[PDB]
């Protein structure tokens, strides 16, 4: 019926990229740069947050089946965003994506697009569709962050701070392979869990079950803290590695 789109962390040691001699740090760097490229290009074009995420998910899934050494990442990214626009009904012309990609990329980077940027991107669409197995519908942590937040009742200002902080954590997780490890529902909970710990909020008080200390179980069944802890740990790693700090 439907394909399985989730791997174990241990499995990422065996992507095509890894097996062609790319080390873990480099593939992680490539994923961040490609994702952020998709994010930045689409933001300049005015694209909805779901359209940006859909392109990023296509991108992340793509490099579970192909190597970064044989498919230049920024071409792939542009192709993903191009298709994502058509899937999420926020379409853009390929020539406008190229235009923006050129504005943001230096001369070396735009070298990936070769002599004819548009064709290199348009050609890849065939591979992209086959690779993602024509499973175009994608759900994202955003919708669950809001669906779950709507069921919280309490201080209007403390909950809005939780949501925005969690929302930022969602945007940051698109640069990681979490999209490939955990369903979006879990991601939405994990970012709520993290924003809560950092803001010293006790979310259970805002739920319909205020004495149910594992507040998330009423939103997402069967999620152990260990799963939530791993996701939280991975998100904060990006901040510690970079110069950026937690939003608070």
């Amino acid at each position: 019926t439907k394909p399985c789109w989730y791997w174990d962390k241990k499995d990422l040691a065996h992507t095509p990229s890894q097996l062609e001699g790319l080390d873990p740090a480099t593939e992680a760097r490539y994923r961040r740069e490609g994702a952020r490229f998709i994010f930045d290009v689409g933001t300049r074009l005015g694209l909805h947050y779901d359209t940006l995420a859909t392109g990023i998910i296509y991108f992340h899934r793509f490099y579970m089946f192909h190597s970064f050494k044989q498919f230049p990442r920024y071409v792939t990214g542009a192709c993903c965003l191009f298709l994502a626009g058509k899937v999420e009904e926020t379409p853009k012309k390929c020539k406008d994506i190229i235009k923006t990609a050129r504005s943001l990329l230096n001369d070396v980077q735009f070298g990936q697009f070769g002599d004819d940027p548009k064709e290199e991107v348009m050609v890849l669409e065939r591979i992209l569709l086959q690779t993602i197995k024509f499973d175009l519908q994608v759900e994202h942590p955003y919708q669950f962050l809001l669906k779950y937040a709507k069921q919280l009742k309490g201080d209007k200002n403390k909950i809005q701070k939780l949501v925005q902080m969690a929302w930022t954590f969602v945007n940051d997780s698109l640069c990681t392979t979490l999209s490939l490890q955990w369903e979006p529902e879990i991601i939405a909970v994990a970012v709520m869990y993290l924003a809560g710990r950092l803001c010293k909020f006790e979310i259970q008080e805002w739920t319909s079950k205020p004495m149910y200390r594992r507040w998330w179980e009423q939103f997402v069944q069967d999620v152990p803290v260990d799963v939530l802890e791993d996701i939280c740990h991975q998100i904060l790693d990006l901040y510690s590695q970079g110069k950026q700090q937690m939003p608070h």
């Binding site: 394909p3 399985c4 298709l83 058509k86 290199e120 569709l129 024509f134 499973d135 175009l136």
Partner: protein, 327 residues
């Protein structure tokens, strides 16, 4: 696995012939050598490459892998032309969308002189169609082009909605500008003939009502060539759009510009007096001018006409297969 679409070859199917021409590509009937199942392949060509894979097909793939209902046609898989190898850039082959094959289309059956539909035949027909629309509508998807060509019939009596190439998600909280021309003129709703930019799920209900009346007359109700003439025909039957029956008609862009010959009074019950009473109320409710006062798909199922129809006791449509051959 069964889920790894886009890889299998079109070779596995033998092309019986071209059954119809689809908006994005022609449709062919075919047989799976392995299973013997009869399937219909819709040809999708990216070879034009004007803007890549067609969005009409993208909608139909995106939506029909999500929608599972007996009254919704199932895409079985997607196959590819024997493609060029090692030359991913040089590949200009086509993709085919596999569907279940349906023997007939509603328009073709009605166009044949004597496909006679009894009251109980229409009950089984409309119940399935509206259940499917209810399913799609509960999933917040709007099948905008509802016509007699799109309703497909199997000799079993199973009815299935088919061409989702013009379907988009509708949010009730967040209105978005939408394409102005979304339905075929004969089955188009009045708000879209007056230029409604934010279409409702009720636009589909209006179409299904046009069909409801058509099944009792064997002739489309509103046949016109131009948008104004269509508004006149609708007005002759349903009444002219007026603020008293449609308070927000004034907000529609073309209301002042587009006027019927007269401010007609509704005659729907008079011109359709031959229709059973249980059905006439259904027609009256579906053909309501104000989309906010027009019944929903669920409400049609909770009607005296369709409430108690049991699909288990399916009534086959008229089978004139042998007397018609040798009159």
């Amino acid at each position: 696995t069964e889920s790894d679409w886009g890889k299998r070859c079109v070779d596995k199917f033998d092309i019986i012939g071209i059954i119809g021409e689809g908006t994005y590509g022609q449709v062919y009937k075919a047989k799976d050598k392995d299973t013997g199942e009869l399937v219909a392949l819709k040809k999708v060509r990216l070879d034009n490459e004007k803007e890549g894979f067609p969005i009409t097909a993208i909608r139909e793939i995106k939506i029909l892998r999500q929608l599972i209902h007996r009254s919704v046609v199932n895409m079985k898989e997607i196959v590819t032309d024997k493609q060029d190898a090692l030359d991913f850039k040089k590949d200009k082959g086509a993709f085919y969308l596999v569907f279940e094959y349906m023997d007939h289309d509603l328009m073709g059956l009605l166009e044949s002189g004597l496909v006679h539909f009894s009251e109980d035949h229409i009950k089984s027909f409309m119940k399935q169609l509206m259940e499917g629309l209810e399913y799609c509508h509960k999933k917040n998807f709007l099948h905008r082009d509802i016509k007699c060509s799109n309703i497909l019939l199997n000799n079993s009596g199973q009815i299935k909605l088919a061409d989702f190439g013009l379907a988009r998600l509708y949010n009730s909280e967040e209105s978005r500008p939408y394409t102005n021309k979304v339905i075929t003129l004969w089955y188009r709703p009045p708000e879209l003939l007056l230029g409604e930019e934010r279409y409702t799920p009720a636009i589909d209900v209006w179409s299904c009502g046009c069909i409801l009346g058509e099944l009792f007359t064997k002739k489309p109700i509103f046949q016109a060539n131009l948008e104004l003439a269509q508004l006149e025909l609708i007005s002759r039957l349903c009444g002219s759009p007026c603020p008293a029956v449609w308070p927000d008609v004034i907000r529609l862009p073309y209301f002042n510009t587009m006027k019927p010959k007269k401010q007609y009074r509704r005659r729907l019950r008079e011109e359709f007096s031959f229709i059973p009473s249980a059905a006439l109320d259904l027609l009256d409710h579906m053909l309501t001018l104000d989309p906010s006062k027009r019944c929903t798909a669920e409400q049609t199922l909770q009607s005296d006409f369709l409430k108690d129809v049991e699909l288990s006791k399916m009534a086959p449509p008229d089978l004139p297969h042998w007397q018609d051959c040798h009159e």
